[PDB]
Amino acid sequence: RLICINDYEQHAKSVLPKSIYDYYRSGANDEETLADNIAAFSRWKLYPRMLRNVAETDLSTSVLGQRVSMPICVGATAMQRMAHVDGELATVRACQSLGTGMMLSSWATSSIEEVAEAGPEALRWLQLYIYKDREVTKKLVRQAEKMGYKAIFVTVDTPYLGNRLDDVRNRFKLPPQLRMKNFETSTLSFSPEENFGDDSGLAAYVAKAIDPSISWEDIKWLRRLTSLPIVAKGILRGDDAREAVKHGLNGILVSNHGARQLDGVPATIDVLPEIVEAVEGKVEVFLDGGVRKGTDVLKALALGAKAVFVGRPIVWGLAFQGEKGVQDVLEILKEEFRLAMALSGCQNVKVIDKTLVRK
Amino acid sequence: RLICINDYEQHAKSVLPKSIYDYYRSGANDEETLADNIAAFSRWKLYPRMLRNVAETDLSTSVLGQRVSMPICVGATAMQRMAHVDGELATVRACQSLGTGMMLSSWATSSIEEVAEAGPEALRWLQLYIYKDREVTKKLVRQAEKMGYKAIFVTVDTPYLGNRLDDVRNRFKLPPQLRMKNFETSTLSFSPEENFGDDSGLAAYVAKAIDPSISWEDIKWLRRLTSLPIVAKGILRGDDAREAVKHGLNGILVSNHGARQLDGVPATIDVLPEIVEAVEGKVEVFLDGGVRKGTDVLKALALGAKAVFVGRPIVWGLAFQGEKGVQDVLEILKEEFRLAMALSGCQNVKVIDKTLVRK
Amino acid sequence: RLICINDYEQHAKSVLPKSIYDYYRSGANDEETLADNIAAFSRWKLYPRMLRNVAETDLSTSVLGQRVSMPICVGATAMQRMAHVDGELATVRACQSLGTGMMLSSWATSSIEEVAEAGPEALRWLQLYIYKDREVTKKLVRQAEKMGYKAIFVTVDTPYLGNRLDDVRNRFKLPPQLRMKNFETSTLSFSPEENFGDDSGLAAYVAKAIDPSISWEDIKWLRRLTSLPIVAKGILRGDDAREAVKHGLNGILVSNHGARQLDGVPATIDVLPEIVEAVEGKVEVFLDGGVRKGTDVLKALALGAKAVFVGRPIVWGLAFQGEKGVQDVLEILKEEFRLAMALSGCQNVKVIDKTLVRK
Amino acid sequence: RLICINDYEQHAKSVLPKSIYDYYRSGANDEETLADNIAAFSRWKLYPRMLRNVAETDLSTSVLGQRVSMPICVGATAMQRMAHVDGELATVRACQSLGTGMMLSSWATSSIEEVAEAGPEALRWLQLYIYKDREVTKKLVRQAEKMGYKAIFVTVDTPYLGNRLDDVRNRFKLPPQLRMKNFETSTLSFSPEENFGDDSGLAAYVAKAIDPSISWEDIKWLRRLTSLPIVAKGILRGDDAREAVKHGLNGILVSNHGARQLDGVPATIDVLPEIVEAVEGKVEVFLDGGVRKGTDVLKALALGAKAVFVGRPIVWGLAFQGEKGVQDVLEILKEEFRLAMALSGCQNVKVIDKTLVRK
Ligand SMILES: Cc1cc2nc3c(=O)[nH]c(=O)nc-3n(C[C@H](O)[C@H](O)[C@H](O)COP(=O)(O)O)c2cc1C
Ligand SMILES: Cc1cc2nc3c(=O)[nH]c(=O)nc-3n(C[C@H](O)[C@H](O)[C@H](O)COP(=O)(O)O)c2cc1C
Ligand SMILES: Cc1cc2nc3c(=O)[nH]c(=O)nc-3n(C[C@H](O)[C@H](O)[C@H](O)COP(=O)(O)O)c2cc1C
Ligand SMILES: Cc1cc2nc3c(=O)[nH]c(=O)nc-3n(C[C@H](O)[C@H](O)[C@H](O)COP(=O)(O)O)c2cc1C
C-alpha cells in the first residue's frame, strides 16, 4: 500500500531500468538545488488559524481563466512512455478524471494530437521549446491551438541542457521503440538510432536542435504569433519577471527546471515571494520544484502562487500503475492539501493568506 | 534502572505491540514538527544567576487558582488502557501522590466518573472535544462539573484528525476489550467491532463524530454553558490568543497537539513568547509538546508559561510499571526541575524570569 | 605517537576503567553544553595579519601579577590519582617544568601541603568550595596561604552537583585506597567505605557537605578573610560579573564547570565577550571549557581573556604517562599556540587583538 | 570514465602511496577550513538571467595584462613529480595546450629553466617564497625574468609551515630520486638524504630555510628588485590588501594556502568580497581554495575576482594520466564554466556581475 508520494519513488526505483530511473531522478552536477527544492519547504513554517469553520473545504480554483478542481496541476515531464507503455495518454486520462490540467512536454513520447484525442475534455496546455528552426516552433504552437490547448508555457531556462552526471555515465537516450512524437525527422524526433558518443543523448539533442541565442526578441515574436495565454517558465529573478510582464505575457512559472539546469540556484519556494512581489498583481504566478505534500501546496499558495505543478511524482505514479497510479498520486496530493487547508482554518483557496507562513 | 525520561521510551517500544507503540509515538506526515518540539528546547540557552541562596527550592505553584506541588502536570493522552491495564486510573493515583493535576481525555478508556472515584482528592480537569451532537458535548461538561473537575481544556486544533502515517499502515483501532468509556453508543465509544477499511480507525472516528464546523460561535456557547474556567488548547497564533481572551476564556494552552495535527507548524517553545505577549498578562498561558527534562520546564516558565503539560512520557511510565511508572516519571521530572531551578539561582517559581533564557 | 590533544583522550578510554573514564568525560544530562564547548570554538573564525615579523614569538604573560611561560594554565580537575598513581603530584611537577600555574582542586586526592612540597617553585592557586562548615572552608584558605598558594579561585556554580548520568548508572565513588586528602573525617574525605545507594557518590558528597545557601554574603566574608587575590569561577552573566567586581574580587573565570553543572548554558567562548565587556577593564578575565588546540587559546585571548585553563586534557595526559604525559600535553598546546600566534601576525601576547576574530 | 573533478581525487587515492596522497590532500590541524573552502561555495546561491542570447559564449579574459583562454589558471602546487614522473613539465604542456597560465612553485621538482623549456609559449609566473638568504630569493626572481615568466606571486602567509597532522605521522619527505630543483645545496634542495626526526620533513625545511621575520620592509625590497608585476598571495584581510596596494603591488591572490596554514580562517570565497571592496578597483584580485566546478568559477568572478587558481585537481590529473590528465581536468572545468556562464545569461566574462550571487 502506497499512502504518500515518497512511497511511490521508493517503488519506481525498484521497477524502472537504471538509465530511465536516473534520467527522471537526476538533478544537475552535484544536485545541491535538487536537495534544496525539498529541504526549503520545511524551513517555511505554518501558522494555522483555529475555529474558522472548515466543514466543506472547497479546493476549486482557476488557472489563466480556466476552472480546475484543485490548485495542483501536472507539469511537463518529457518522454513518459519510458515509465509506462501508456505514457502521456495515461496521464491526460488521470487529469480528465481529477478535473485538473496537464502541461504537455514538447519532448513528449505522444503527439499533441494523440493527447487531445485521449483527453478531449481535459484542460491541456503546451510546454514550448524554441527551436533553431522557427517553422518547427510555429508548427507546435499552431497544432496546440488547433487541438484545444489553452495556453503556451515557454521554457526560458534551457539555452543548453544542464549537465546531469548519471545521463552522461549511462549514455542516456530513448529505448529503440520510442520517439519524440511531435517531430518527423530522425534528428528532431530524438531517434535512438543515432550513436551519441560518450555523453548524454539529450544534451546532444538540445545542442543540435534548440536555439541557444533565445532572447526577449523571440518572446516578442511568440507573443505576436499566438493569442493564447503565454507563461514564462524558468524565471528566477524579479527583474526578469518584470520584463516578462512588459512583453505582454500572461503568467510566470517559478521553476529551476526541477533542479536540472543551473545547479546552485535557490529553491523555487524561496524565490517565489520575490517574483510575486516583482509582478505587482499583474499576472498569475505558479510554482514547480519539490512539491510532494499537501502542505507544500499550502505554502506556495500562502506565498502567492495561484497553483503549483507536479513533476516527478507523476512519473512515479506512471511507473507504479499507469493511469491509475497517476490518478492515485493526484488524489493523495488532493486529500493532503484538503486536510492541510482545513487544519489551517481555510474553507476555500481564497482565504489562504500569507500570515499562514513565516521562514 | 531508568533514570531519565528517554530511558522510558526506549523501554516502552520493547514491551508495547507495534500498533499501540506507533499510535502513541507518531507525529503527522513527515514528522517535522515532532522532531522540532524537542530540538527547539535545545536552541534556547540558559543564563543562570549564581550566589542567590537556593537552599530550600520550593517547586509549588498554582494552575487556574488551584495549588499544585510543581508546575508540571499530566496532559490528556487518549486511551491509556492500551499501555497498561490500569490506564487512566493508575495515572490519577500517581497524580494524587505527586500533588499535581491530571487532564483527562474525552477519549479516555476510563470514564469521567471512574477517574474521580480512583483519585477523589486529585486535581482533575477535562479535555473537551466539541461533538457534532451538542448534547454529547453538554453531557461531558455536566459530568465533569458533577464529579469535581476544576476546568475545561477545549481542544481547538482538531476539526479533523491529522494524518499519522503509521496509524493508517497499521489500520489503528482499540483492542477488542477496550472502548472510549465516556460514551454509550458503538459509534461514539470507538467500538473496535467496526471494520474501518484501509485507513486509521481514529481518523474515521473523528470524521464521523467530531464537528469540523467548530467556530468562535461554539466558544461563546461553551462559555455560557459552564462557569468552570475554560482554557483554549491548540492555539499557535497571537491573533487567535487575543480572540480567546476576548471570548472570556481563562487560559491558553500553547500546543501543536504533540505534533500530530498540522505538520510544519513551529515548536511550542518557539511560539510561546508570541502568545505570552499577545495575552498581555490577562490570562495564564501553559505549554505542552516536547517536555522531557527539568530544563525544558525551566525554559517554558522563564518564557512566561505558568505550568507545562507532559504527554508521551506518562504513557511510557504507564507501559513500564503502571501507577509506579507514571509516579516515577513524574518524580524524575520534579527532581530535574528542582536541580535546574537551584543551579540557575531560583529558590522558588516566582523568581524565575525571562533573563534566564536567550535563543 | 600522540601528536595532538584528541590523540590523548582516545588513548585514555583504552586504559582507564569505565567508571573513572565516564566520571572525567561526562557532561550533565544530555551533554548539550559539553558538545557546544567544543563546537563553539569552530564558529569563531580567525583573520590573521601577514608580514608582521614573527621571528621570536614570545608566549610569556602574567596571571594576577605572577609571571607564566604561556597563557595556558592547569584547571582544578578533582581526584587525579584515579587517572595516575602520582595524581596531583605528577601534575604540579609538569607545571614546574613548563613555567605555568596549577589550580589545585579542593577535592584533590593529594593535600594542599603535599602539592606545595612536590612543586615548591611552581605557581599554585587553590580552587575553593564553600563548605557548610565554615571552619573547614577557613582551614583550606589558611593552609593555601601558609603553603605559598598565590590566589583563591572560588567556585560559585555548584550549590548542588549537576546530574551526570553515567556517574549515577556507575554508582561513582573513589577506589578503596583513595580519599579527598584535604579532609580528615570520613564524610569530608569522600571515604569510599560508605554505601551511597542508587546514585552518584559525588552528588551525595556535595549534598551533605557543600552549602547550597551560598550567596554574595559569603563572598563578602571570604574577601575579608584573605588578602590573596580572589577569582569568581563559574560566572556566565554580565550582571553577576559586575557584582563580583563590586565585591572587591580580583578576577572572573568564565566557566560552565566543564559542561557538568547546568546543561544548556552557552559555550564559554560564546559568553566570554559579554563578561569582558561587563568588567570594563577592572579585573582580569580567564576562560575554561573546550580548550584542546592552540587556536582555541588564540581565540579566547583575542576576545579578551588573559589566560585559559585546561581541564580534561591534563587528566588524559596523566592517564597516558603520568608526569611526562601531562608535560607532553602542555608542550603540545604551547607549540600549537606559538604556531597559531605566528601565523596570525602576533610576535607576543600583547599584540593579540580582537580584530583577529569574528563569529 | 572520469567526467567531473571529484572523480579524479577518488582515483588519485587509489594510485598514490599514502604519504604522497596525504601530503597533497591535507589541511592544517583539524581541517575545518579545508572543509569550509568547499562548503562555502554552496552557500552562495546563483540568480541566473534568462533570454540574454548566449550562442557563442566567449571564455577569454586577461590576467595582469596577458591574455588567457579562460579565467581558470594553474596554482603553484609543490613537488609535482611525486604524482607523476613528468611532474611540472606535463603541467606546463597542458597549460600550453589550453591557452591558460601556470604558476610555478618555488618548491617545484622541476627548475624554472626546465619549465620554460618544456612550455616556451605557455604563460608562466613564479610563486616566490622569501628565503633567509636574500641572494637565493634574488636568484629565483632573476631566473624567472631571464626565462620569460610574466609575474611574481609572493606568498605572504607562511612565516612557518602549518601543522598538517598526516605529514608528521608519515614523517613526510621527498622520495629518494627527487629534489627541489631550483636549489643547489642539500639543505635548500630538500634532499631526502637527511633524517628529519619525528616530524614533517617540510616543516623542518621551512623552519631552517624560510625567513619568519618577513615584513612589509621585504615587500618594499622586492618591489624595487623587479619591474615584473607582483601579486600578494595569502591575504585574508581588507587592511592588509590596502597595505599591498600602497606598497605598489599589482594584484592580490585571496588564499588561505589551500587550508594548510592557519586553520579556522574563513573560506576564500567568503573573504573575497571584503578584499575586492578594500582594493577599490586599483588592482586585480584572484582567488584559490576549493575550486572544483564551473559554478565555483562563476561565483568567484561574480564576486569580483579576475580569475581563479586550481590547486589539488591538477595534482589529481597528474596522478591519473600525466599531461593528458591535467589537460582533461582543465577541459572539464572549462566546459563546466562555459555551461554555467551560458545558463546564467552570460555571453562573455565582462557581463558577469554581482547580481548573479547572494549568500
Ligand atoms: C524527467 C523530467 C523531465 C522534464 N522534462 C521537461 C521538459 O520537457 N520541458 C520543461 O520545460 N521542463 C521539464 N522538466 C522540468 C519540469 O517541468 C518541472 O519543473 C519539475 O519536474 C518540477 O519539479 P519536481 O520534479 O520536483 O516536481 C522535467 C523534469 C523531469 C524530472
Ligand atoms: C498518544 C497521544 C494521545 C493524545 N490524545 C489527545 C486527546 O485525546 N485530546 C487532546 O486534546 N490532545 C491529545 N494529545 C496531545 C496532548 O494533549 C499533548 O499536546 C502532547 O502529547 C504533548 O506533547 P508530548 O507528547 O511531546 O509531551 C495526544 C497526544 C498523544 C501522544
Ligand atoms: C574530571 C573533572 C573534575 C573537575 N573537578 C572540579 C573541581 O573539583 N572544582 C571546580 O571548581 N571545577 C572542577 N571541574 C571543572 C574544571 O575546573 C574546568 O572548568 C573544566 O574541566 C574545563 O573544561 P575542559 O574539561 O573541557 O578543559 C572538573 C572538571 C572535570 C572534567
Ligand atoms: C600539495 C600542495 C602544495 C602546495 N604548494 C604551495 C607552494 O609551494 N607555494 C604556495 O604559495 N602555495 C602552495 N599551495 C597552496 C596553493 O597555491 C593553493 O592556494 C591551493 O592548492 C588552492 O586550493 P585547492 O588545492 O583547494 O584548489 C599548495 C597546496 C597543495 C595542496
PDB file of C-alpha atoms in Angstrom, chain C residues 1-4 6-7 10 38 41-57 292-296 298-299 336 338-345 353-358, chain D residues 29-30 32-33 36 130 155-163 165-166 168-171 197-199 211-216 219 234-240 243 261-266 271 274:
ATOM      1  CA  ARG C   1      52.785   8.573  18.815  1.00  0.00           C
ATOM      2  CA  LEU C   2      50.395  11.106  20.308  1.00  0.00           C
ATOM      3  CA  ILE C   3      50.768  14.397  18.431  1.00  0.00           C
ATOM      4  CA  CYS C   4      47.606  16.325  19.313  1.00  0.00           C
ATOM      5  CA  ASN C   6      42.496  14.458  20.703  1.00  0.00           C
ATOM      6  CA  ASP C   7      45.004  11.564  20.486  1.00  0.00           C
ATOM      7  CA  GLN C  10      41.299   8.307  22.508  1.00  0.00           C
ATOM      8  CA  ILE C  38      33.999  22.413  21.560  1.00  0.00           C
ATOM      9  CA  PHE C  41      35.355  27.487  19.112  1.00  0.00           C
ATOM     10  CA  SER C  42      34.975  26.458  15.452  1.00  0.00           C
ATOM     11  CA  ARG C  43      32.339  29.102  14.810  1.00  0.00           C
ATOM     12  CA  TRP C  44      34.725  31.948  15.715  1.00  0.00           C
ATOM     13  CA  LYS C  45      36.832  32.447  12.618  1.00  0.00           C
ATOM     14  CA  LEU C  46      40.404  33.811  12.509  1.00  0.00           C
ATOM     15  CA  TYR C  47      41.518  36.855  10.472  1.00  0.00           C
ATOM     16  CA  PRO C  48      45.346  36.685  10.505  1.00  0.00           C
ATOM     17  CA  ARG C  49      47.602  39.637   9.679  1.00  0.00           C
ATOM     18  CA  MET C  50      50.508  38.941   7.332  1.00  0.00           C
ATOM     19  CA  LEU C  51      54.058  40.305   7.146  1.00  0.00           C
ATOM     20  CA  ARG C  52      54.249  41.377  10.809  1.00  0.00           C
ATOM     21  CA  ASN C  53      57.694  39.893  11.681  1.00  0.00           C
ATOM     22  CA  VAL C  54      57.082  36.896  13.991  1.00  0.00           C
ATOM     23  CA  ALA C  55      60.672  35.540  14.246  1.00  0.00           C
ATOM     24  CA  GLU C  56      60.856  35.212  18.018  1.00  0.00           C
ATOM     25  CA  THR C  57      57.272  34.586  19.175  1.00  0.00           C
ATOM     26  CA  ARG C 292      42.035  21.468  23.007  1.00  0.00           C
ATOM     27  CA  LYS C 293      44.079  23.386  20.445  1.00  0.00           C
ATOM     28  CA  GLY C 294      46.467  26.351  20.196  1.00  0.00           C
ATOM     29  CA  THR C 295      43.877  28.171  18.036  1.00  0.00           C
ATOM     30  CA  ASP C 296      41.367  27.838  20.918  1.00  0.00           C
ATOM     31  CA  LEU C 298      44.330  32.398  20.445  1.00  0.00           C
ATOM     32  CA  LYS C 299      40.571  32.908  20.123  1.00  0.00           C
ATOM     33  CA  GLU C 336      50.246  24.850  18.753  1.00  0.00           C
ATOM     34  CA  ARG C 338      53.054  29.533  19.261  1.00  0.00           C
ATOM     35  CA  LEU C 339      52.366  28.431  15.654  1.00  0.00           C
ATOM     36  CA  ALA C 340      48.880  29.946  15.709  1.00  0.00           C
ATOM     37  CA  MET C 341      50.212  33.281  17.134  1.00  0.00           C
ATOM     38  CA  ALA C 342      52.970  33.461  14.483  1.00  0.00           C
ATOM     39  CA  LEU C 343      50.643  32.582  11.545  1.00  0.00           C
ATOM     40  CA  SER C 344      48.264  35.340  12.701  1.00  0.00           C
ATOM     41  CA  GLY C 345      50.995  38.012  12.776  1.00  0.00           C
ATOM     42  CA  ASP C 353      43.722  41.881  19.445  1.00  0.00           C
ATOM     43  CA  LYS C 354      40.051  41.299  18.792  1.00  0.00           C
ATOM     44  CA  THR C 355      40.204  42.132  15.042  1.00  0.00           C
ATOM     45  CA  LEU C 356      41.687  38.622  14.850  1.00  0.00           C
ATOM     46  CA  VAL C 357      38.230  37.075  15.379  1.00  0.00           C
ATOM     47  CA  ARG C 358      34.682  37.296  14.054  1.00  0.00           C
TER      48      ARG C 358
ATOM     49  CA  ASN D  29      45.227  20.546  12.214  1.00  0.00           C
ATOM     50  CA  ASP D  30      41.503  19.596  12.423  1.00  0.00           C
ATOM     51  CA  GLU D  32      37.989  22.965   9.429  1.00  0.00           C
ATOM     52  CA  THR D  33      38.999  25.479   6.779  1.00  0.00           C
ATOM     53  CA  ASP D  36      34.813  25.092   4.531  1.00  0.00           C
ATOM     54  CA  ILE D 130      61.214  34.760   0.776  1.00  0.00           C
ATOM     55  CA  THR D 155      53.438  34.046  -0.684  1.00  0.00           C
ATOM     56  CA  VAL D 156      52.916  36.120   2.490  1.00  0.00           C
ATOM     57  CA  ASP D 157      51.168  33.585   4.801  1.00  0.00           C
ATOM     58  CA  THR D 158      53.979  31.069   5.536  1.00  0.00           C
ATOM     59  CA  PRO D 159      56.458  32.595   8.030  1.00  0.00           C
ATOM     60  CA  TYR D 160      56.423  28.937   9.324  1.00  0.00           C
ATOM     61  CA  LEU D 161      54.668  25.901   7.837  1.00  0.00           C
ATOM     62  CA  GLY D 162      51.174  24.982   9.082  1.00  0.00           C
ATOM     63  CA  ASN D 163      50.869  21.775  11.107  1.00  0.00           C
ATOM     64  CA  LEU D 165      48.915  16.115  11.060  1.00  0.00           C
ATOM     65  CA  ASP D 166      49.312  13.323   8.496  1.00  0.00           C
ATOM     66  CA  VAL D 168      54.016  14.420  10.843  1.00  0.00           C
ATOM     67  CA  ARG D 169      52.596  10.900  11.389  1.00  0.00           C
ATOM     68  CA  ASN D 170      54.005   9.883   7.971  1.00  0.00           C
ATOM     69  CA  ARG D 171      57.356  11.678   8.527  1.00  0.00           C
ATOM     70  CA  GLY D 197      63.284  13.080  13.066  1.00  0.00           C
ATOM     71  CA  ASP D 198      59.750  12.671  14.461  1.00  0.00           C
ATOM     72  CA  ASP D 199      58.032  15.378  12.400  1.00  0.00           C
ATOM     73  CA  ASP D 211      62.502  33.699   6.954  1.00  0.00           C
ATOM     74  CA  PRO D 212      59.824  34.038   9.712  1.00  0.00           C
ATOM     75  CA  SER D 213      60.779  37.731  10.092  1.00  0.00           C
ATOM     76  CA  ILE D 214      59.171  38.532   6.723  1.00  0.00           C
ATOM     77  CA  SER D 215      57.591  42.023   6.861  1.00  0.00           C
ATOM     78  CA  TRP D 216      56.384  44.924   4.675  1.00  0.00           C
ATOM     79  CA  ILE D 219      57.869  43.754   0.221  1.00  0.00           C
ATOM     80  CA  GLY D 234      47.790  34.694   1.163  1.00  0.00           C
ATOM     81  CA  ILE D 235      45.994  37.929   2.066  1.00  0.00           C
ATOM     82  CA  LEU D 236      42.764  37.428   4.019  1.00  0.00           C
ATOM     83  CA  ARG D 237      42.126  40.913   5.486  1.00  0.00           C
ATOM     84  CA  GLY D 238      40.990  44.169   3.948  1.00  0.00           C
ATOM     85  CA  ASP D 239      43.508  46.281   5.869  1.00  0.00           C
ATOM     86  CA  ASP D 240      46.422  44.065   4.585  1.00  0.00           C
ATOM     87  CA  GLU D 243      48.738  47.889   2.520  1.00  0.00           C
ATOM     88  CA  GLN D 261      48.418  27.126   7.150  1.00  0.00           C
ATOM     89  CA  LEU D 262      46.257  28.685   9.908  1.00  0.00           C
ATOM     90  CA  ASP D 263      43.157  26.513  10.429  1.00  0.00           C
ATOM     91  CA  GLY D 264      39.909  28.257  11.307  1.00  0.00           C
ATOM     92  CA  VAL D 265      40.368  31.128   8.894  1.00  0.00           C
ATOM     93  CA  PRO D 266      37.326  31.749   6.620  1.00  0.00           C
ATOM     94  CA  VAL D 271      36.628  36.788   2.317  1.00  0.00           C
ATOM     95  CA  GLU D 274      35.882  42.232   1.590  1.00  0.00           C
TER      96      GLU D 274
END
